[PDB]
Amino acid sequence: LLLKLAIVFAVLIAIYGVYLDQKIRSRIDGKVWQLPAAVYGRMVNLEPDMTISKNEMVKLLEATQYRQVSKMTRPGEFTVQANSIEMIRRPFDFPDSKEGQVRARLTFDGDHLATIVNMENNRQFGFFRLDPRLITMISNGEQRLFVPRSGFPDLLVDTLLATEDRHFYTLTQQLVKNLFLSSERSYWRKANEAYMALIMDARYSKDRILELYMNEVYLGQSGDNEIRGFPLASLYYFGRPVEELSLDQQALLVGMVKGASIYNPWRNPKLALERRNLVLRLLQQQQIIDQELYDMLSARPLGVQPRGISPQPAFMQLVRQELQAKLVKDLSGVKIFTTFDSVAQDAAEKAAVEGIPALKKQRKLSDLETAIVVVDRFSGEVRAMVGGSEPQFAGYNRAMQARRSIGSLAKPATYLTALSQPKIYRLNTWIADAPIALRQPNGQVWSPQNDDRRYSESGRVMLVDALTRSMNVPTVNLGMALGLPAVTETWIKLGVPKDQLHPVPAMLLGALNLTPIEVAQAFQTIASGGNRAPLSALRSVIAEDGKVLYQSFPQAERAVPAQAAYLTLWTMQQVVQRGTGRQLGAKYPNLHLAGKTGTTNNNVDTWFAGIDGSTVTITWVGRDNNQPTKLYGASGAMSIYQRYLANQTPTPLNLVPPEDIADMGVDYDGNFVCSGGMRILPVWTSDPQSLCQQS
Numbered sequence: 001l002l003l004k005l006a007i008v009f010a011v012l013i014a015i016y017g018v019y020l021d022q023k024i025r026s027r028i029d030g031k032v033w034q035l036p037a038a039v040y041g042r043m044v045n046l047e048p049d050m051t052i053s054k055n056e057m058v059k060l061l062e063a064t065q066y067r068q069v070s071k072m073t074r075p076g077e078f079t080v081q082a083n084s085i086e087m088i089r090r091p092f093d094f095p096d097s098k099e100g101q102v103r104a105r106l107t108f109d110g111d112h113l114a115t116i117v118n119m120e121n122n123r124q125f126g127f128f129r130l131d132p133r134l135i136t137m138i139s140n141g142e143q144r145l146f147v148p149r150s151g152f153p154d155l156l157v158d159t160l161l162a163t164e165d166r167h168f169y170t171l172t173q174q175l176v177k178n179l180f181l182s183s184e185r186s187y188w189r190k191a192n193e194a195y196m197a198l199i200m201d202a203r204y205s206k207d208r209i210l211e212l213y214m215n216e217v218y219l220g221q222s223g224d225n226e227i228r229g230f231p232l233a234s235l236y237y238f239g240r241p242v243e244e245l246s247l248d249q250q251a252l253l254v255g256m257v258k259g260a261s262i263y264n265p266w267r268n269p270k271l272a273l274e275r276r277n278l279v280l281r282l283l284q285q286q287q288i289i290d291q292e293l294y295d296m297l298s299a300r301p302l303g304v305q306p307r308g309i310s311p312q313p314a315f316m317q318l319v320r321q322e323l324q325a326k327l328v329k330d331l332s333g334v335k336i337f338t339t340f341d342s343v344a345q346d347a348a349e350k351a352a353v354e355g356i357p358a359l360k361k362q363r364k365l366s367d368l369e370t371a372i373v374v375v376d377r378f379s380g381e382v383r384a385m386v387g388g389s390e391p392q393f394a395g396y397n398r399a400m401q402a403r404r405s406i407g408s409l410a411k412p413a414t415y416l417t418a419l420s421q422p423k424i425y426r427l428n429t430w431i432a433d434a435p436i437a438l439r440q441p442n443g444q445v446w447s448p449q450n451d452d453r454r455y456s457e458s459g460r461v462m463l464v465d466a467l468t469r470s471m472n473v474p475t476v477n478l479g480m481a482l483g484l485p486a487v488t489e490t491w492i493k494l495g496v497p498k499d500q501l502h503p504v505p506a507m508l509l510g511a512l513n514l515t516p517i518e519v520a521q522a523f524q525t526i527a528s529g530g531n532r533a534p535l536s537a538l539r540s541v542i543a544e545d546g547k548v549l550y551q552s553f554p555q556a557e558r559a560v561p562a563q564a565a566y567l568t569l570w571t572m573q574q575v576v577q578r579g580t581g582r583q584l585g586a587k588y589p590n591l592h593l594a595g596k597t598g599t600t601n602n603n604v605d606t607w608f609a610g611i612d613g614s615t616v617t618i619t620w621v622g623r624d625n626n627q628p629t630k631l632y633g634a635s636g637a638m639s640i641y642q643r644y645l646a647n648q649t650p651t652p653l654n655l656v657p658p659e660d661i662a663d664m665g666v667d668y669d670g671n672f673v674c675s676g677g678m679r680i681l682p683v684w685t686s687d688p689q690s691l692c693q694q695s
């Protein structure tokens, strides 16, 4: 009868199901989604007898997205007591060794970490890793962070099932519409969805359905990129992974699945709160949660938001730039490990945010800007980078794009050149301080003056005092005698771009326009003791399969002699102690900081190079329109550095003298003496018998 039309239509939709099975299979049995590249900060490893205090550790933990509690229950939490800290270190897929949860007690003895013990067996650790903070993702227009089935708490699955579905066969229906279908309200779509769902549940286990659903679900928007899945939304909304969510935060994310844009907590927080509360009760009907919990959860805010799009634009410019140079875009699930220090960045960002309007008010300024570059003294690894006064939201990066006159910050390269000649130039060497009238080409005289337009009553100064005081006249007399090609060579060795070097007499006093990052490289070279460590933001880039796509190795090259670098830095400590930066030296006398101040003609640029035990901080404070700032090195850029130093626990500079360094006695006349002397200065000699030749 009509079975010639009935059965043929049953075997017509059947072959369509084979095409549908092949479509669902080809996506899952391969690549489900293109997962963006995860960007992680620095990986800190803690060791016994490490120079780190309890308070510094609290700040480090808090900067690593840890929460200070009274009773430790879940990971990413810590408790602080009299002379120790207890913490549950969150699981992390470290490149060296994959680690899980660990209960550790960090014991402190003054300013140092005494011991780190495993609270499971009371065994002392040799080294203890600390997971890196996730900075951002490198963007399809959709952003994800894949977490397998095990990564999700059993409670969160139960929170999702109670609000959504029973699950005994819809949860699998919603999955297929987001994964393969259109946005349409249509009945064809609903039929195509339900038919796909029946094929979906049959060929794949309930664990896989949950794994795919929990990672696909649209839960937010960050401008042009779509925040989807529970793991990324957990970090975007609170700053905690999916494994560390509290029941109230857990319920909000499970609530947004129905309408992420309207149930959003940034815009209309009441509709989001009403929904969260409209989720907590749904769990309450079921025997899973007790009546005791509901009341406290309803009153306590679900958000609790960070609260905020483009994280770390300045530092990210460098990360992207290095990624192209070293290597990538085709690959998915890439983990990029950086050298980013969250503690340093916070200290710097706060200094810029607070300090800039503070200087703008103090000096009645229309506009003022900054640039801060923190690099490791010995590795050149970039710790912090701020490209402005408002660094949370940026497009124009002053640390990398703004090319400005270095001013006096050019002076140590002249004195370093001189001090690389131990038989000729020493700290006690007399340099002439009398009017200069050098004839430049065209027949036009170049007459450089000291800041006060004065000269020494003796017509001379000790090399040490000339750098200490940032005296222009003696600097010119030193560099001209040395030669411009020798000073230009010191700049090449230091690590400044060659194409910026124009060796004219003016180069000695600051006619060298560099960006704060480039200046960092130069000062890093002196601070390390003469070894030039090419600046880097990249530590390692790892693939989804754990393959090492790129690995960072030291490229440190001996640029200047250690003894010459030591003597420049020793004088750079004199700068901060009694010289131009004496305001900083009085504020932090136990830090024995090396530093140099820079002010350009008509107060256009203010600079400060700050060296402590472990970092090199280059800070510039100026205006984009190149107008006078009314600030000096010590008033502008050094003040932002003072703020940066205060916002953290800086390392005291213990300038360990290399070989052939000998503290020698000097008379008023500048002559070496066997015993006594009115001045003690470090000298580069294997045999301090320069005094016998002098006597």
Ligand SMILES: *C(=O)[C@@H](NC(=O)[C@H](N)c1ccccc1)[C@@H]1N[C@@H](C(=O)O)C(C)(C)S1
Pocket: 406, 407, 408, 409, 450, 451, 452, 469, 470, 471, 472, 580, 597, 598, 599, 600, 601, 602, 603, 632, 633, 634
């Ligand atoms: C370096 O920046 C030097 N600055 C100047 O010579 C400027 N021409 C100048 C600005 C303002 C007043 C006089 C000169 C020297 N170092 C400065 C500093 O350390 O900040 C300086 C003012 C001591 S002079």
